[PDB]
Design a protein around this ligand. Structure first.
Ligand SMILES: COc1ccc(CC(=O)Nc2cccc(Cl)c2)cc1
Length: 186
């Protein structure tokens, strides 16, 4: 099946807890995979305009590890619940992808999660201005704009709204698309 195939692919790139004990400032993100209309999608947030870091930017759910978290996956799930109402029974964490090093002292660990088909986002407006889906296949043929760094523009055909996706968030989306969608018979 589509979902068993995606999970099998993802597991081959799992690094597990290999880098998780290193003494960094630690953040986790959840890369949430949603199956709709027979295709996989990634779920993104738009950060609230009143957040201090990166207001109004497109971002995966996530945040800083705190002492309650059993592990880095727990960070991702706790933050996703706070931000978009995703409950732990609604997500299967499949793997941990390559972590992202930033600012010399920070390590961001991405987890891919399969999201239940009955999940509907309940975003906390203090943190999240918007939640939207992008088909995973978009990231194989994105609409690129050069700002010099590359920016993806995705227009939701449901409503004509265009979102800009860039940086780590864009990079991770492409990685997931490659992992899951490469070398597939039609
Ligand atoms: C630069 O390092 C990071 C990048 C992304 C994150 C994930 C994140 O913060 N997500 C979020 C999405 C909407 C609202 C809120 Cl409050 C948070 C954390 C660290």
């Amino acid at each position: 099946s589509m979902l068993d195939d995606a999970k099998a692919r993802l597991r081959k790139y799992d690094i597990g807890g290999k880098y998780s004990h290193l003494p960094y400032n630690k953040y986790s993100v959840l890369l949430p995979l949603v199956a709709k209309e027979g295709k996989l999608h990634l779920l993104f947030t738009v950060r609230s305009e009143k957040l201090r870091r990166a207001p109004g930017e497109v971002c995966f759910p996530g945040g800083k590890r705190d002492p309650t978290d059993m592990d880095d996956a727990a960070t991702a799930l706790r933050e996703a619940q706070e931000e978009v109402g995703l409950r732990p029974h609604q997500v299967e964490v499949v793997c941990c992808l390559v972590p992202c090093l930033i600012d010399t002292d920070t390590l961001i660990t991405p987890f891919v999660g399969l999201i239940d088909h009955n999940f509907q986002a309940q975003p906390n407006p203090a943190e999240v201005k918007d939640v939207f889906l992008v088909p995973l296949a978009y990231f194989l043929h994105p609409q690129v704009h050069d700002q010099i760094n590359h920016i993806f523009e995705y227009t939701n055909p449901e409503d004509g709204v265009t979102y800009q996706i860039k940086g780590m968030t864009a990079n991770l989306a492409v990685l997931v698309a490659f992992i899951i969608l490469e070398k597939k018979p039609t």
